[PDB]
């Protein structure tokens, strides 16, 4: 059984970051926008887009 | 209303020997293609004395109008439910089975819980099931509600709901024949039909590594797999 | 009256490796066509610090001998379950399966919880299920334990509960022929027999809308559908 | 070691309008060939001021925070699960799937419960699943974990596993034929083959008293009944 390692995703509240490759056996990244849907949080990021 | 306080309502059935309860559920929405349910009822979550909040509720206990922090006071449908948003007159929760909606106080000497019968179903909008969107898998259309207080009312809308993805679909091209080595880890509905003037009219739900050979007349084929966005070929190389 | 005491007893499944729990269900009675349960716990219900209530219990969990409100002590099968009456060693509650009872503490320090998978069952004495009240058909006997004290054991007494009679029993009589137009929602047993010197002995379990034709010779027939004692028609189209 | 702290982790559905929650299980290890689980939780279970304890936990959030003694916080699959030992960041418990753990607290500002069910699939090295090796029946070598306290993680331990078998494997000998009158109390996998030139590779799961005849070479036959390494009889009336 594998163990998934997440180092922690780089999250910019009201910004963005492009993927930087790192050498791991099944290294995969994706850049994901949103993070938090609009009107869904109580101390969430202001930017939901 | 949202700022209006809970009140006694007809429902003379509780699980204890006290049954003088609120709750009758004015309206409920739960005929979504999500997993979440919006309830409009007296025994209001999202309302304390401060008006509309996201993590406090108010209730008539059977005769005691008060507010508390959510402790041993639980919403349920046919299973426990952990709320997602509270909006005054409206409760919003993730409640996976749906159907019956049960708001209850599991307090000491007076333990009231009302359940109201309703048809709250969560179903495909396409052919992939929804009943509790997780956070892993492809986002697909669904009905949902706004999940933050606007104090405007919570009413139906359409949003995006996660549904499970499956492993790599290994396609193998051959001449006038496309064998699809498919490897679900989870129930995928495999629908095929050709994108030619031939057809492959085969719906089947599949699980686990299998092969399925299909005809191609020289115009490929469409296969939708898991109701995930179609994998389609139009070649005679297919 | 009550000749019971709250104390620890061994339960093979608890929330910690600490299995020095009370609330350990010695016996359960569930031989009914109801939904209610008489539970015999090692912990005493119907005695709190102040004695007799209908919604407080007392216990010793080998770490605290105290009483609490049935709030801190919740019965569950997963979702809450509300007690109705207490008779010392015995509890009487509504908790629909009534063969799986998990009694657990959200009291003070340490989490003792006993779960019981008792040998008693709810069952029909007929040929088709009515073991728990449905919404289908009309009542047949059940057992519902006394909700006041009447010896430490709550006595079992007969009561009335809903019973299955098969959904939509459209009978149609015709010449020499009895068609039974059936439209169940669930597996119903259809038994027929002639009452005269005609035969027709036909047991079948059916699901989904179907028809079942029988001969008639002008000498009656009985059809029971979904657990009934004889329903009879005679000397014609029967 | 025991340097673990309480912290938040992303959950699919947890209380409040954000699931950046307490009591959220980051990872789970099901890397056993038993039924035991090593759990890695952001919120710490198993530690008060004592170091390694069996009955206190801590958690934090920002919206629904506090620490408690384990009591209002119940672990469940839907029934209790008992921890045995804590090694800081790692929790060790016996729980049946060993991949699905649902932890929730029914006290504090909201009623949060996180469930983890993300894969780390396993089954015993035999063919029957356990939640922890039972007393009943044959032993099988397997992997599991360390369960004694010693605080870093509870690393796999080559140590015994046990598979339950059914009560009566009544073998009946005849000339070149062995009928196995089997009397399941519980689902047993019966795999057979005759020993010798003749062989009868037949796997079947059975429940309830049945007979199953197999041909025999006259050189013996193997039947494993209820997950065993070969139980075999040799040339005789086999």
From Swiss-Prot, chains B, C, D:
Membrane topology value: Single-pass type I membrane protein
Post-translational modification: Palmitoylated via thioester bonds. These palmitoylations may induce disruption of the C-terminus transmembrane. This would result in the reorientation of E2 C-terminus from lumenal to cytoplasmic side.
Residue intervals on the Extracellular side: 1-238
Location of the protein in the cell: Virion membrane; Host cell membrane
Subunit structure of this chain's protein: Processing of the precursor of protein E3/E2 into E2 and E3 results in a heterodimer of the spike glycoproteins E2 and E1. Spike at virion surface are constituted of three E2-E1 heterodimers. Interacts with 6K protein.
Function (record text): Plays a role in viral attachment to target host cell, by binding to the cell receptor. Synthesized as a p62 precursor which is processed by furin at the cell membrane just before virion budding, giving rise to E2-E1 heterodimer. The p62-E1 heterodimer is stable, whereas E2-E1 is unstable and dissociate at low pH. p62 is processed at the last step, presumably to avoid E1 fusion activation before its final export to cell surface.
Protein name, UniProt field: Spike glycoprotein E2
Organism: Eastern equine encephalitis virus (strain Florida 91-469)
């Amino acid at each position: 059984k594998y163990k998934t390692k997440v180092p922690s995703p780089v999250v910019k509240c009201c910004g963005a970051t492009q993927c930087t490759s790192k050498p791991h056996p099944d290294y995969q990244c994706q850049v994901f926008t949103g993070v938090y849907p609009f009107m869904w949080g109580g101390a969430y990021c202001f930017c939901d887009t | 209303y949202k700022l209006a306080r809970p009140y006694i309502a007809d429902c003379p059935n509780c699980g204890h020997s006290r049954c003088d309860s609120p709750i009758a559920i004015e309206e409920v929405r739960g005929d979504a293609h999500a997993g979440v349910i919006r309830i409009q009822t007296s025994a209001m979550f999202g309302l304390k004395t401060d008006g509309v909040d996201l993590a406090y509720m108010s209730f008539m206990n059977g005769k005691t109008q008060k507010s508390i922090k959510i402790d041993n006071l639980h919403v349920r449908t046919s299973a426990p439910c952990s709320l997602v948003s509270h909006h005054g007159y409206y409760i919003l929760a993730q409640c996976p089975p749906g159907d019956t909606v049960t708001v209850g106080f599991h307090d000491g000497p007076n333990r009231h819980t009302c359940t109201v019968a309703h048809k709250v179903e969560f179903r495909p909008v396409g052919r992939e099931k929804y009943r509790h969107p997780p956070e892993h898998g492809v986002e697909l259309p669904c009905n949902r509600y706004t999940h933050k207080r606007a104090d405007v009312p919570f009413v139906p809308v359409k949003a995006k709901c996660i549904a499970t993805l499956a492993p790599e679909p290994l396609v193998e091209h051959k001449h006038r024949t496309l064998i699809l080595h498919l490897h679900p880890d989870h129930p995928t509905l495999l629908t095929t039909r050709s994108l030619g003037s031939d057809a492959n009219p085969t719906r089947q739900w599949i699980e686990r590594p299998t092969t399925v050979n299909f005809t191609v007349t020289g115009e490929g084929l469409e296969y939708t797999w898991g109701n995930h966005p179609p994998k389609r070929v139009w070649a005679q190389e297919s």
